[PDB]
């Protein structure tokens, strides 16, 4: 019945008064009424955070509390987590470093956040992998907290994957800034993919010293978390181009949603605890009641949290803690040095924005691209014959070739979509052959304006 | 001059000998410091901490269990105010491993090994005892998950896996459901990762199934032999232990040491900057917090009472001294003394469960076999049986009786149905050379059908990317 | 068979003869460099697995 939003007023400067107008009014008619009390915090101190959650949990008697702030201290995350464990209030932090994801949660702890778990990121990082047919990687990490989860999640995935990769050396920089151990494992890698692993202060260094080994260049693309691109406004002069990266969506979905999102989320549950319990939960007296000791004699918001739907999204929380269905754009350092991005996550599918690969170029002294050629095909004759994607690990299987056609979009819809199949055949196994003896990369995609071609008004064809 | 530092401490005699020791360690080489007992709220516990130690501007907090059997008391609130700014504490008797991931807990030095560096000793335990085939109960805890996780990365090392791995919940009453699948295996030695509350849970349900009889071995934490379950543990317990493990005080004058020999070094470094004075008006980071951090880290003390004082990369002390415990009459009994990557026993007996004296090796050789066989025609005939329980007796042409099963499959061979597992008679090719090999291989066979009726290839699971095999 | 002839004039610390000399998969090599440069080339490709 009251729901309480904190924000930082440092990144939300019109939001002073516009959460306070922004509420579930007109939202959606839910059998509960809930009025949101906006609160903002001058700092995020540990003590004045303690203090004002307290005391909202005192006044008012908050059944839920959204906490978004400007900090990208990880801190606050960890005291929202210990908060809502002890006052028995459930938290969710819409916005920056309430955002990040703790690894493990206490279960009494009630705090839900909006990011997304290293796993989501690598899960998205393989899928961007199968969708570019980038089948050889050589993972590297740093020794940082949460490298080794990471690791084993991504060799788990790895060896219980129907598409086959060919994942080489796992490289594990014991100490970064070395430069004895470190260059003798990086020369090992003879690889076109590495799943960098590094803090954003790391990973200069070790990009740096790639550059300085030769790990740079067209033939080398680096798929990189979201915590290494954590502020996307500070993009160091180390970064190569062309850097793939995975991150939560800053552009689309922001506060004004973020906080709607949530209100939204904890008022399904809240009507969903009051569809099974007829009593609405009560609010505790006071967080400095040492004396008395409380309990939760009523379930708690779990269950609810989990089956939840809002607004047509399925905004679900999973049984570990995390977001069934995260944003997860990812991103790619642009040729101006300005992240942009190439693929917004989907409902389970990676809607990568370019069919091709961009190709895009590191630091300005690498050289140009003398094998790579871009190849034109009609899938006419059966010398070449386009045949969709396997529907068990989704790819060119055996003896076809990535190839992309440029399909029209609907049918009376000028928009043209690029999609990637795979076509074959005797050119096709023809151009494999010449590609493997003559050592050259090519870029098959099939050709729209025509046939073979004809001269047409002095202009060629095809 | 003056260098703070900060203590809470579980009582005010601690305090006093905080004191007298921080004293000790400035006179044997100009550093202040201040103390403040524990609190039952947490939220006003850690408020309180804020307030003093922060507004003291102190540079580490060192941070002790209370006298309480509770879990994660004093530590949770101390370091997440103190890792909000930085400032690295050091944990004096929490093993608890949820404090030994970084990403939650950001500066959290501690004296003592966790409960989950205990498996590295199982290992050992597996070595000089030559057992290879283990079985694994642990709880659904992070404490659990750990312990499992370092056995595991451990083991793969050796090229060796554990035979089963069963997992709990925090607080069931019933598990002889999960002991009853423990007893059908080869293994026949457990290591136990669980609560004292679990810990004598597991011990009644097993006893009740004479596990703790001969030829059954026990490998049990250091917090599953004290308490109720010491009560209840059976005869021949491999328990450990820590030495001076609950010793409050060699471990303060260990980490007051070990911080001023860490201060007098980073003083001693380029330009510093003051911890903040308040601990509120202020959300920024300490800019050399994670420099003393790495330093506290990587200083080496071998003058400690404890002995030599080593943190690993995780933040945790390394090459902890474990003392072996056998259970013996109702009393624990030291047995040995495990430093680091060796374990080294002495001329006590050590007498296992059911009062063996030899090394019992838990590899049960079963010869049970359980075999699945698919129905096909030229090879293995499947028939209904006859009312009198047993299948007709069929002769061949030569005049020689034929050799019949007593199979156990499902007679709905249609699809979709509710297949019931009912004894037919199978017998052919393969069954002849099943009787040749378990009268050669002294086998004593359960031959059965299987439920899906396919010879089995690779299936992608139902609406995921994870292979499985049908 | 002879290919993969490699030719470096970006000395041995540089990222042109790292990549250039990553390109050498044959198992025989025919060197040609003076006494001093020999050893560096040496120390780089053993730096590498040659
Ligand atoms: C709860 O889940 C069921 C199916 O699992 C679904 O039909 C129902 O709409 C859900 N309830 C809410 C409030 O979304
Ligand atoms: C969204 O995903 C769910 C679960 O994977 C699936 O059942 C549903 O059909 C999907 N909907 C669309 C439009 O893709
Ligand atoms: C040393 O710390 C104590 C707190 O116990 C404080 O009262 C005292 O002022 C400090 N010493 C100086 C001279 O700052
Ligand atoms: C629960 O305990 C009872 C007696 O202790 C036992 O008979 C029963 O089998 C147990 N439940 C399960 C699922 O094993
Ligand atoms: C356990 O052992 C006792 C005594 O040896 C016996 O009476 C009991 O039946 C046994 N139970 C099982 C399940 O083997
Ligand atoms: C163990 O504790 C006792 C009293 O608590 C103390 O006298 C003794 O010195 C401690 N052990 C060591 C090695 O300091
Ligand atoms: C462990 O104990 C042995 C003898 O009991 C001793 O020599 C060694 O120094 C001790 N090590 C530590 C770290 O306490
Ligand atoms: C201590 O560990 C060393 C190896 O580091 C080992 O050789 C020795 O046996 C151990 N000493 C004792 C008896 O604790
Ligand atoms: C198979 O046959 C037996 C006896 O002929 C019958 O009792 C049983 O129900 C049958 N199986 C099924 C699944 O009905
Ligand atoms: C194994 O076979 C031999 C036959 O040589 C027999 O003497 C022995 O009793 C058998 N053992 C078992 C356990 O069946």
Redesign the interface.
Known sequence: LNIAVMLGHSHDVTERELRTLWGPEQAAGLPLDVNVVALLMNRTDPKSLITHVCDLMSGARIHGLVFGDDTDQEAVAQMLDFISSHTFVPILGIHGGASMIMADKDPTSTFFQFGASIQQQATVMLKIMQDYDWHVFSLVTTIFPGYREFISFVKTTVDNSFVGWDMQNVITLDTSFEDAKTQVQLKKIHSSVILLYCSKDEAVLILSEARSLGLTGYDFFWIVPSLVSGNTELIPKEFPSGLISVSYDDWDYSLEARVRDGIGILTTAASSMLEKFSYIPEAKASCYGQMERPEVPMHTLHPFMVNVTWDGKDLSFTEEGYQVHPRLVVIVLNKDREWEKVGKWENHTLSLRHAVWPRYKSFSDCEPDDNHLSIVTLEEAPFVIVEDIDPLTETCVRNTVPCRKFVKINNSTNEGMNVKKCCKGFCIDILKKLSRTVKFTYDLYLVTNGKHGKKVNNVWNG | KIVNIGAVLSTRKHEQMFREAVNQANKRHQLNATSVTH??????M??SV??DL?SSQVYAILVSHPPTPND?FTP??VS??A??YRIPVLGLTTRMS?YS??????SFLRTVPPYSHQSSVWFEMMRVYSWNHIILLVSDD?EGRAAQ?RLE?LLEERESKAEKVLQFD?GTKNVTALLMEAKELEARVIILSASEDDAATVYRAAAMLNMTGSGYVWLVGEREISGNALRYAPDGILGLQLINGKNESAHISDAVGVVAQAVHELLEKENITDPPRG?????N?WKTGPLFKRVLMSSKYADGVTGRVEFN?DGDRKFANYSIMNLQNRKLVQVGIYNGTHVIPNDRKIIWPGGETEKPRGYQMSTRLKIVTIHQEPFVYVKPTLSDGTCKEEFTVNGDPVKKVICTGPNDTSPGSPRHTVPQCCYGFCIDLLIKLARTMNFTYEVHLVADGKFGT?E?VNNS???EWN
């Open positions: 609190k039952p709220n947490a939220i006003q850690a408020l804020c307030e922060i994660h949770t609130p997440y105010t890792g909000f949820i991931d970084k990403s939650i807990h950001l992070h996780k990365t925090p601990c509120v008006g202020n959300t980071i990369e690779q992608r990317n994870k292979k």
